[PDB]
Structure formats: C-alpha cells, structure tokens
C-alpha cells in the first residue's frame, strides 16, 4: 500500500500520500473553542473547530496553537488535530497506512516517545517512522551534501550534512522563527496607532506580514530612505475596511532574523549561526558546505532574503570561497516533498518501526536502531 | 608473461608492470573507515575507502596508515590495500603474474614470512620474490658500486655496496623519515597559532611540507636572516581559505634530518650516519664509496639537500678524497625503476620463489637460498 507522509510542523500541517509533488491538504494547526454564550438553539454548534474551519469562524473563537516551539505542549489538542487530518482532510483510515512524521532536531525525548505511543495506540497505524526535518529538505533539493537552514514557523535549525554523513556536533538550533516575527510586527504596528490584541487578530497581523514585509538588502540605507521619501508606504485593507499604511515597519519586522537583539534575544542572526555551524565542521568539507548552502521552510520566503544572506556570509567567509545560496521556488513544501521522496524509496522500506517491534520494546524503541 | 613490480613502501604504494619507465598507479596507502553516523539512505556508503579515494572523502574519515616504520602493523588493512592495488588500479588478476615486493633492511622476519604467505595463499600468485629496497635504487642509477641513502617516508637506511658485493655489517638503519618530519612540522606550526590535530589535517601539513620546506645550506645564517628580514615568509592557502604564512619554519622542519636531537632522537643526522657507514667498510673501497654516494627515496627531494649533504661530508671526510652526490631527477621512483630493471633481466628469471617450492618448505622458504 501507500504511505502517509504527514508533517506536523508548527503553524501549518502538511499531509499527503507518498509519491506526489505537493501535499494534498494544507491547513493551519489551530483548535479554537467558542468563548461567548450562544443563544440560538439547534444551530448545531460544536465544541471545538479545528483546522481550516476555525479560520473562518475566528471572530468568536479563541484559537490556540497546540505546538509552541517544535515541542508539543497540549497533547489532547494535537491528538484532535491528527484525527481531523486523517479522517476529514484525507479520508483514509490509519489502520491500513504507514506514517512518516517529522520532528525538529534537539527536541525533548518525551515528545517523540509520546508521539509514537499515540500513533500506535490510538490511531493504530501499521508502522511509523520519525525523521529529522532538515534531512528531508536536503532530499528535495536532489543534493547529497550541503548545510540546510530550515527556518520554519516554530524553530529555526541549521543541520550541516556531508556526503550523507550528518555532523551531530554542528547542529545549531535557534528558537526565533515566524511566530516571534508575527509578535514583533504586532508590537511595532502600535507605533502608528493600530492595536491588535485578540488571538484572532494575530492572524490578521500574520497576513500583513506575509503580504507586505520584505528583507532589506542594506538596513541603514533603507532606514534612511524610508525616513525621507514615501515610496515605501504600502497600504492594506483590513477584514472590515479602514485601510492601514505600513511605513518602515515593512523591512523592520523580518530584520529581526539577522539581529535577534530586537526582540531581546541574545544570540546572533541567521546570517552568523550558519557561518558558526560551518566553522565547527572539519577543515576539508568547508568549501562544499559554502557552495551548497540550502534554504528551506516557510519563513525563508521573504522577498530579498537570498541576497541579504549571501551578502552577509560573503562578508564573513574568506574571500576565495564561492558562496552560493540554493533557494528553490517550492521552498514552503520542501520538507514534505523530501518526505515523499524518502517514503517512496525501496531501500528505505525496511526501516519502518513495525508494530510487533513496538510491542516488544515499548515506546522507547524510537531512540534505538530504528531512529 | 609479464611480472608485477609492486613496491609497498610506507606512504605511497607504487606499482606497475615490469619493463616500463614509471609506475602505472601511485596512490597513498591509507584505509579510512567513516566515523560519523550517516543519515542519507541508499547513498551507497561503503565501510572502508582505500587508496586515492580516501584522500577525497578525508573530511569525514579517520585515515590510518597500515605500515608504521617499514614493518606492517595491521595485516587486514595491508591485505585490503594489496587487493585494491591488484584489482582496481591495475585490473590484472594475480593468478597469472609474478610479483616482486620490496622490503627495508633489518626488518623483522615475521613480517616477510607473513607477506609471502599472504601472496601465496590469498592472492595465489605464481611466484614472488622479495628484494631489499636499496639494491634496486642502485640498479636504477646504472652503477654497480656506491653507498645508497634511501630516505623513504617510513625509515631511512644506508646500504653500502661494492662491485656487487653487499657489506652486511655496514648497514645503518635509522627510523627518522618523512612521517616524523610531518609530525615535527605540525608541532612547530603551533608557534604561530595554526593548530592541526585531526588525522585528516596531517595530510594538509604534509602538503605544506612538500610545497614550501627546503633544506638550508647553513643553518645558523638562515636562522639569523629569517629573524631580521622578511624575504623568506611564503604564504599558502588552506583547503578553505585563510592563507597562512610560514616563516623560519620552512628550513627548520627538514633540518631535523641533520640534527635528530630536535625530535628527541639521540642518533646522528643523515650526514654523519653515511660517514660512519663508510668508515665501517674496508680501507681500500672507501674512495669509490666516497665518489659514488647515491641519494634515493622521496624525502631526499627537498630543494637544496644535495649541497648541504655534500658540504657536511666534505667537512667530515679527509681533504684529498673527492665527494660526489648522485641525485637523479627521478629520485622518488628510483626504487621502482630499479625493480623494473631487475625483473626484466634474463639472468634473474630463475630466482623467483616458485609455488611448488613454497608448498614443500612452508613460508620459511624466503630466508633460504631464494632470498
């Protein structure tokens, strides 16, 4: 039979059968209970709208993501999300399909063990396998080397790989991602008068960020230009009218990636954690990693980031090496495409964690040889 | 049929059919298992890369030479190296070709006996013969007398020969060679800030030594000059950028040959063990040995050694004798060229150790008349 390539993510759940080009169903991972009282009788009001249904009734819900930073903080809601994904968005019972979840690097063990225990006890799948979210993104590019920066919505991690041999001592995981950029944008919009507070209006700020923000090639020059002319002010129409005008908030929101001091984080930007991740590698594979830097994940879709990052790394790196940044147009679904490719391989067909194996060793089987 | 003139050496395996000018395939003798984990499936990752393949993937391997000082310390790896040499670099099955290995003087017997046992049982050659590495280097020079200093990469030995009669009581074998010079260079580079530790970076230090180091004609004057001017500082680009500048480390690394007290060895340099080897000979053949001093082996390729050695010996020797140092441009492959010449001789064709002879007397046949 065919395998189910699910990809929990944090912000958008992407799923679909193995062997295709794009995920079959992509929908936000939010579960929102209603918060008001409700007076109409017999309206058929449910107790929790999940997935894309709660992005249409969000006016009277309190949306809450079940995955904070890669890790899962609310297991009941995550189980509800998985149940919805299997039964309503794909309509395939899990009793007859292997599953291939994905997990960020350096995550707590208990999260992974609970994930496999749920998949084997509640949904009762035949066999499931958990894979690191960066190796798949490297599969999708058709490479076999390269250092991949997978800046998702929950957590940004940077896994270097050479000739198929991952370097476990050079993984640099940073917890700045799309959600913190949404919060920072929502916080700097208040400097013009627009106040978004409700958890429903966070979605509106996210839409503003997606449609308007861009990464500046040079920060100081853009700050000077936006403060003199008015060629940058782009307007946007809220879900009820009252258009708003975003000035130099456009390139200040995604600039947080390269200067995490804006949101008070100490660490260095995504332009310098990649160079540090390279320098921890051996001295003889640094040229190949320099030449095959891969971008993935949703948050790396800002217009103009593949040039800013290249300029920064070229500034840091030695002058002789060639710096090349692979930015495929299908960046958002790169991890899932790689997952489909991996699940479609014949050599991989014996790596699944078969159910009888789980019955013999318990949920701690995932840390064992079947990784 | 044609004979296979293999030459194990220590650092570079040189092989080729008898009767040519240069070895057909020359490649480092290193076998490196991968050391990291490896996440890509189906990449076709082998368990041990040998020869020149492991000098390209050395970034994720742990290279380890199977021959320490002439002697062989790891027989399985040496068997792997031989198998590679026969089947992939020459592509001739050994069942139809005599072999002519080479061995340093004064080596343990068990090494030679195990070598012949392997060649007769595993590879199943028709007949093999083991020859001393210095007599061949004397063949290649077209001489018949002379004292040859064969400073390889494993061990430096100094065999005097007159009129074809070797003098077994005058062989002076010293264990300082190219590998110790590489280690000493890697140890003195730390005085400027460059630290090379990994077994892969030993190859980089070896490349630095080959391309930059030279032997000073007079040591104290060079030490004084390099400490005042800056006309010696030559720069070199690492495999990733970050050029380095070598100062008076240039002529201090190969100076260890003439002053083995630098690496803590007690014995006298290669300039004085040759004179001692001569003085042990009879009083009537010392003039001929003085006039026909032969250099061979890789490590004698330093620019300016054929003058320093001549100056030193002229200082030691009596003033009347003429001191001449033969330094052919084809020094590195001198032993193998001599091996080809010896294997191509008709008079030598009945000295091979035929397989039936080995079957009758066991591996101890090599010490017998068939030397």
């Amino acid at each position: 039979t065919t395998a189910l390539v699910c990809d929990n993510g944090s912000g958008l759940v992407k799923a679909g059968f193995a062997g295709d080009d794009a995920p079959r169903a992509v929908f936000p991972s939010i579960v929102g209970r209603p918060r008001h009282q409700g007076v109409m009788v017999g309206m058929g009001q449910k107790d929790s709208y999940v997935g894309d249904e709660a992005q249409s009734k969000r006016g009277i819900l309190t949306l809450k993501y079940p995955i904070e930073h890669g890790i899962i903080t609310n297991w009941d809601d995550m189980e509800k999300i998985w149940h919805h994904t299997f039964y309503n968005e794909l309509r395939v019972a899990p009793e007859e399909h292997p599953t291939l979840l994905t997990e960020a690097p350096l995550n707590p063990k208990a999260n992974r063990e609970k994930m496999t225990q749920i998949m084997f006890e509640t949904f009762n799948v035949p066999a499931m396998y958990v894979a690191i979210q960066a190796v798949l993104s490297l599969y999708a590019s058709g490479r076999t080397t390269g250092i991949v920066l997978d800046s998702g919505d929950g957590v940004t991690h940077n896994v270097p790989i050479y000739e198929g041999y991952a370097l476990p001592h050079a993984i640099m995981r940073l917890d700045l991602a799309g959600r913190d950029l949404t919060d920072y944008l929502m916080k700097i919009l208040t400097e013009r008068g627009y106040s978004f507070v409700t958890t429903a209006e966070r979605e509106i700020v996210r839409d503003i960020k997606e449609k308007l923000c861009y990464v500046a090639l040079d920060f100081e020059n853009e700050m000077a230009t936006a403060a003199s002319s008015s060629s940058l002010e782009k307007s946007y129409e809220l879900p009820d009218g009252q258009v708003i005008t975003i000035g130099n908030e456009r390139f200040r929101c995604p600039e947080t990636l390269f200067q995490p001091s804006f949101i008070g984080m100490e660490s260095a930007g995504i332009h310098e954690t990649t160079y540090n991740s390279i320098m921890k590698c051996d001295i003889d594979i640094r040229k190949d990693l320099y030449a095959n830097n891969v971008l993935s994940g949703g948050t790396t879709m800002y217009p103009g980031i593949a040039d800013r990052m290249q300029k920064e790394i070229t500034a840091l790196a030695p002058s002789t090496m060639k710096i090349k940044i692979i930015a495929p147009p299908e960046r958002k679904y790169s991890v899932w495409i790689g997952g489909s490719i991996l699940a479609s391989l014949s050599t991989f067909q014996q790596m699944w964690i078969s159910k009888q194996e789980y019955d013999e060793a318990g949920p701690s089987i995932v840390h064992r040889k079947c990784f | 049929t044609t004979a296979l003139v293999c030459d194990n050496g220590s650092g570079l395996v040189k092989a080729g059919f008898a009767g040519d000018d240069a070895p057909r395939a020359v490649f480092p003798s290193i076998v490196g298992r991968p050391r990291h984990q490896g996440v890509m499936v189906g990449m076709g990752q082998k368990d041990s890369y040998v020869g020149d393949e492991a000098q390209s993937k050395r970034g994720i391997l742990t290279l380890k030479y199977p021959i320490e000082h002439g002697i062989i310390t790891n027989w399985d790896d040496m068997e792997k190296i031989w198998h590679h040499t026969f089947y992939n670099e020459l592509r001739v099955a050994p069942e139809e070709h005599p072999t002519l290995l080479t061995e340093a003087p004064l080596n343990p017997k068990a090494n030679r006996e195990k070598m012949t046992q392997i060649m007769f049982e595993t590879f199943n050659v028709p007949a093999m013969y083991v020859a001393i590495q210095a007599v061949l280097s004397l063949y290649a020079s077209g001489r018949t007398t002379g004292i040859v200093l064969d400073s390889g990469d494993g061990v430096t030995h100094n065999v005097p020969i007159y009129e074809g009669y070797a003098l077994p009581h005058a062989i002076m074998r010293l264990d300082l060679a190219g590998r110790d010079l590489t280690d000493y260079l890697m140890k003195i580079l730390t005085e400027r800030g460059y630290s090379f530790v990994t077994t892969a970076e030993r190859e980089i230090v070896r490349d630095i030594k080959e391309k930059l180091c030279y032997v000073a004609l007079d040591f104290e004057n060079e030490m004084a000059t390099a400490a005042s001017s800056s006309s010696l500082e030559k720069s070199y680009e690492l495999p990733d950028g970050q050029v380095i500048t070598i100062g008076n480390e240039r002529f201090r690394c190969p100076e260890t040959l003439f002053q083995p007290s630098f690496i803590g060895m007690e014995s006298a340099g290669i300039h004085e063990t040759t004179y001692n080897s001569i003085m042990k000979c009879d009083i009537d053949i010392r003039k001929d040995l003085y006039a026909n001093n032969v250099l061979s082996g890789g490590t004698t390729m330093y620019p300016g050694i054929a003058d320093r050695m001549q100056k030193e010996i002229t200082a030691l020797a009596p003033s009347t004798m003429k001191i001449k140092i033969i330094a052919p441009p084809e020094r590195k492959y001198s032993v193998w060229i001599g091996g080809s010449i010896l294997a191509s001789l008709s008079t030598f064709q009945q000295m091979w150790i035929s397989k039936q002879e080995y079957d009758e007397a066991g591996p101890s046949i090599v010490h017998r008349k068939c030397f």
Partner: peptide, 16 residues
Amino acid sequence: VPPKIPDGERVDFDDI
C-alpha cells in the same frame, strides 16, 4: 544505539 542505515545503491540528482 544510533540508527545505522542499511545497504542501498542509489539515486541522486535525478528525481529532482
């Protein structure tokens, strides 16, 4: 015990 990937053969840079 880390997951040791079993013995495969290919492929790369073609399905892409």
